[PDB]
C-alpha cells in the first residue's frame, strides 16, 4: 500500500501536489485521482512535451519563443501539459518557461518515483520538501511519480504516460468537443 502524496517546499517558492503510484495502475484510476482528490478540471488540449533526455541548450530566441509559446498557449486553452518531471533535459527548459511568465497554468509531470533525489523524506505526507536520483522540476505543481519499486532506471513512466495520453484522449469527459481533449505532441 502506497505512502506518499506530499508537496515540494523548496527554499523562489512554489507548492505542488503529487502521489507515488506503480506501473500497475489504471489510467481511469489516475483519471478520477486527477479529477476528484486532486480536484482538477479537464483540459481542452494535452501538450505532451518530450525532449532530449540529457540537459541540452537552445538558442536565446528559441528559449524565449518556446517559453512565451508554451505559456501563452497554456493560457488560451487552459490546459495541462504532460512532461517528464526531473530538472533535466526539456523539462528544465519547461520549468524555466513557467518561471518566465510566473503570474497565475498547471503542468502535469509523469515521471518515475524510481528516480528521485531524497526518496525517503518525500514519503512524508504533505510535508515541507526544500529540494536543494534527480530532484523533480520545482516549477511543477503536478507530477505523478510511479514507484515501480526499482530505483535509478527510467521506467514506469513511458508506459504510464502512454496509457494516460490515450485514455484522456479517448474517455471524453466534460464538454468533449470532437472526441475528448485533442492531444498534440510537441
Amino acid at each position: 500500500p502506497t505512502d506518499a502524496f506530499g508537496t515540494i517546499e523548496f527554499q523562489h517558492s512554489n507548492k505542488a501536489m503529487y502521489v507515488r503510484v506503480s506501473f500497475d495502475t489504471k489510467p481511469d484510476l489516475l483519471l478520477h485521482l486527477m479529477t476528484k482528490e486532486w480536484q482538477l478540471e479537464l483540459p481542452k488540449l494535452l501538450i505532451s512535451v518530450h525532449g532530449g533526455l540529457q540537459n541540452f541548450e537552445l538558442q536565446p530566441k528559441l528559449k524565449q519563443v518556446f517559453g512565451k509559446g508554451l505559456i501563452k498557449a497554456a493560457m488560451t486553452t487552459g490546459a495541462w501539459i504532460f512532461t517528464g518531471g526531473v530538472n533535466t533535459g526539456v523539462i528544465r527548459h519547461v520549468g524555466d518557461a513557467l518561471k518566465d511568465h510566473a503570474s497565475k497554468i498547471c503542468t502535469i509531470g509523469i515521471a518515475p518515483w524510481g528516480i528521485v533525489e531524497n526518496q525517503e523524506d518525500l514519503i512524508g505526507r504533505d510535508v515541507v520538501r526544500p529540494y536543494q536520483l534527480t530532484v523533480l522540476n520545482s516549477m511543477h505543481s503536478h507530477f505523478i511519480l510511479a514507484d515501480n519499486g526499482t530505483t535509478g532506471k527510467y521506467g514506469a513512466e513511458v508506459k504510464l504516460r502512454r496509457q494516460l495520453e490515450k485514455h484522456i484522449s479517448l474517455q471524453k469527459i466534460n464538454t468533449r468537443i470532437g472526441q475528448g481533449v485533442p492531444v498534440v505532441a510537441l
Partner: protein, 101 residues
C-alpha cells in the same frame, strides 16, 4: 572570454571554500554576478545556519542585490527576522551613515 570573471572564478575554487565561505567573499567584493553564476548552484546543499548569518552581514553592509539573492531564493524574512537580529541591525556601525544616533 573575460579575465575579470576568470580571475574572480579562479579564486572561488582557489579559496578551497564551501558555498558560505564563497558567498561571504563575494559579499565583501560587492560582486553578486559571480555569486549567481558559480556560488549558487542546482542540487547540492549549503550548511544549516550559513544562509541566515550571511544576512546579518548583507543588510548591515547595504548589499541590496545580495539581499535579492540571499533571502528571496531561500531565506524567508518570515523565518529570519527576530527581536535579537533586528536589534543587531539597529546597532551596527557598518555601511552608510545615519542620523539615528
Amino acid at each position: 572570454q573575460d579575465i575579470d570573471l576568470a580571475i574572480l572564478t579562479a579564486l572561488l575554487k582557489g579559496a578551497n571554500a564551501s558555498a558560505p565561505d564563497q558567498l561571504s567573499l563575494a559579499l565583501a567584493w560587492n560582486r553578486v554576478d559571480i555569486a549567481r553564476s558559480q556560488i549558487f548552484i542546482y542540487g547540492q546543499q549549503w550548511p544549516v545556519g550559513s544562509l541566515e548569518q550571511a544576512m546579518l552581514d548583507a543588510l548591515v553592509l547595504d548589499r541590496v542585490d545580495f539581499v535579492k539573492l540571499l533571502i528571496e531564493n531561500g531565506v524567508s524574512m518570515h523565518r529570519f527576522l527576530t527581536i535579537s537580529r533586528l536589534e543587531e541591525l539597529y546597532n551596527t556601525r557598518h555601511g552608510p551613515s545615519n542620523t539615528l544616533y
